[PDB]
Design a protein around this nucleic acid. Structure first.
Lengths: 203, 99, 204, 105
RNA sequence: UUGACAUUGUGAAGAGACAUAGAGGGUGUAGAAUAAGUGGGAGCUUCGGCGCCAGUGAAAUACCACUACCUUUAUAGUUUC
């Protein structure tokens, strides 16, 4: 078996071979468009444990996201309010850049459905990811019961409702005592304990 | 860990005939199999060393394990990781450059 | 393992060409500081003799100058004082007591130098002379830590078979490691360059 | 003003319970250390936007400070604190004022 | 606006020291004798020769080693300029 070797090689990033490959590929990917098609998964291991089965319908896209904080709008810096809220430069945009990549390729290939995604590369200006989209109307995926749950219409834009891999992190959804503000969802657990419940026979 | 029978003290608890059941098969998740050892050794000898590992095998031969732990904790997260990483670099220097 | 090399054993017996008693020498390696109170300051009992010649200048007193005429090397007194301060050097190590501690200020310029006297470390002024003489003529080791990092001692003779010398290098490993102070490093068995007197060095 | 550098006063020590000698020093504020609770909380609240949060003082008028003397016993070397009134020129030294000698003008 | 880190690589200079050997260097008294210290130790080589002893000094040697001390990089990769 030889995905274990790719797995462990990809775990050794700043070694001399992988930083050579990382430099050639950050050059090559920077010379193409912002969102373009990956003909073949550049990491068959990491694509393969996220649900890629190489047959007709699975598509990889490769996507550049601009990298850094979020300079707020509201022009010439004036927020018009309390000096609590007077920041511009240092505000940090709660969704990860991996989520922005998934959402943008979700809009551009709107017939397809995002499945997960994975990192590939970064310089200072850009992060490059690959998204592992599925074409749900294709007959190879409308059959084959391990992957036909994507065909159901509740998974339209899993990427935009935080339902993907990096979404459920960015929503803070895990079990624990460290996720009490967002465990079943942040606003449902807000609203269920700002709701005054009144009975008929008031206790 | 026989509980003493009273409400407080050294072993706090009720006397209960115990069972010590069959083990779950995890509690053994991290233990590396023969295939994992061969693969990780092979990729370690292909891949070489990352540059902070080169600067740590610098400091172990030159300045010593105290300053190596002081850099490796700074270069990584936790101090318990700076233990095992400097242990790895001790094994790397000792098993190779001696003979 | 200590079995592949010689280290006390039969393997290094024909390497040296001198057919005289050539003793094996073990060197410990542990980085210590420059101080004098740290390190392994102890000389234990060596169970097999080192097979050396040593004569004792027993300058004893009333209660202890009688047990030297049975099992000892030389019988001396405190009256013979004009020899051990000027001329004579025919000795290897002495043996004294606690009953006469005012004669010790006189034999210092000649015998403290080449290790023929006692200062603070070796069990030379031991009072008992009826049982400790079955331990000093069977010649012991020499645990003496130097300035930066070395510990040169002697275990036994290379011509001695590997049957007497099987629990001697093991009992000596438990002395420089367990009387060890906390100014010693990890893997105190770090480097053991063992050479006897003439042949090559056999290390672990 | 002036005080003696020694003072035989009461000494609670569980072994003294009596007037012993005490050496007398003058009190210092102390090094304003981090990692105490209020400085940690203050340094968290000051983080980010908002500006100055906890109120900062401008209005002082008391020209002096009350002076605290640190008494130390000499047997059990425990420490007691003691206080004075407000005073401008404080010294713990000697040179007791004389019996009215020749003033030299 | 100014600094640090990242994007950020490859050659050629000047010093700090490590894989990797070895030539030599290291002169306050005394002591055949330049013993920077230690361990074994009365002998080795066909012989010669030195050595044990003797004497000396804080240190006794012929013979094999460790730490070291100042050079020497000719062999390999890292440092701040």
């Amino acid at each position: 078996g030889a995905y274990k070797y790719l797995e462990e090689l990809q775990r050794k990033k700043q070694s001399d071979v992988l930083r050579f490959l990382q430099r050639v590929r950050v050059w090559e990917y920077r010379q193409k468009n912002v969102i373009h098609r990956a003909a073949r998964p550049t990491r068959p291991d990491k694509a393969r444990r996220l649900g890629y089965k190489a047959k007709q319908g699975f598509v990889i896209y490769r996507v550049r996201v601009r990298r850094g904080n979020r300079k707020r709008p509201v022009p010439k810096g004036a927020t018009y309010g309390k000096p609590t809220n007077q920041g511009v430069n240092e505000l940090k945009y709660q969704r990860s850049l991996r989520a922005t990549a998934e959402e943008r390729v979700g809009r551009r290939a709107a017939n397809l459905r995002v499945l997960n995604s994975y990192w590939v590369n970064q310089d200072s200006t850009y992060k490059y990811f690959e998204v592992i989209l599925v074409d749900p109307q294709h007959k190879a995926i409308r059959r084959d019961a391990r992957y036909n749950w994507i065909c159901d219409p509740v998974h339209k834009h899993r990427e935009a409702r935080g339902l993907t891999a990096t979404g459920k992190k960015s929503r803070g959804i895990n079990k624990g005592h460290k996720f009490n503000n967002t465990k079943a969802g942040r606003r449902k657990t807000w609203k269920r304990q700002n709701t005054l419940s009144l009975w008929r026979y008031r206790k | 860990t026989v509980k003493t029978g009273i409400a407080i003290g050294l072993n706090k608890g009720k006397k209960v005939t115990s069972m010590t059941p069959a083990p779950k098969i995890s509690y053994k998740k991290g233990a590396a199999s023969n295939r994992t050892k061969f693969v990780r050794s092979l990729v370690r000898e292909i891949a070489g060393l990352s540059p902070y590992e080169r600067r740590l095998i610098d400091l172990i031969r030159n300045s010593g394990e105290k300053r190596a732990r002081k850099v490796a904790k700074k270069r990584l997260g936790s101090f318990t990781r700076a233990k095992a990483k400097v242990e790895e670099m001790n094994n790397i220097i000792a098993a190779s450059r001696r003979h | 393992v200590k079995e592949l090399l010689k280290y006390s054993n039969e393997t290094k017996k024909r390497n040296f060409l001198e057919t005289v008693e050539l003793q094996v020498g073990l060197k410990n390696y542990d980085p210590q500081r420059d101080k004098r109170f740290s390190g392994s300051l102890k000389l234990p009992n060596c169970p097999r003799p080192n097979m050396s010649i040593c004569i004792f200048g027993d300058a004893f007193d009333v209660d202890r100058a009688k047990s030297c005429g049975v099992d000892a090397m030389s019988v001396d007194d405190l009256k013979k004082l004009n020899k051990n301060k000027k001329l004579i050097k025919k000795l290897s190590k002495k043996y004294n007591a606690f009953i006469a501690s005012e004669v010790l200020i006189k034999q210092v310029p000649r015998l403290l130098g080449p290790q023929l006297s006692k200062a603070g470390k070796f069990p030379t002024p031991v009072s008992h002379n009826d049982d400790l003489y079955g331990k000093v003529t069977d010649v012991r080791s020499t645990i003496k830590f130097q300035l930066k990092k070395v510990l040169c001692l002697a275990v036994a003779v290379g011509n001695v078979e590997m049957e007497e010398d099987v629990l001697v290098n093991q009992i000596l490993m438990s002395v420089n490691f367990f009387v060890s102070l906390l100014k010693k490093n990890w893997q105190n068995v770090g480097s053991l360059v063992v050479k006897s007197s003439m042949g090559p060095a056999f290390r672990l | 003003v002036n005080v003696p550098k020694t003072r035989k006063t009461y000494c609670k020590g569980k072994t003294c319970r009596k007037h012993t000698q005490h050496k007398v020093t003058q009190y210092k504020a102390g090094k304003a250390s981090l990692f105490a609770q209020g400085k940690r909380r203050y340094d968290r609240k000051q983080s980010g936007f908002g500006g100055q949060t906890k109120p900062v003082f401008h209005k002082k008028a008391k020209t002096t400070k009350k002076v605290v003397l640190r008494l130390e016993c000499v047997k059990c070397k425990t420490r007691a604190q003691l206080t004075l009134k407000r005073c401008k020129h404080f010294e713990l030294g000697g040179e007791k004022k004389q019996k009215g000698q020749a003033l030299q003008f």
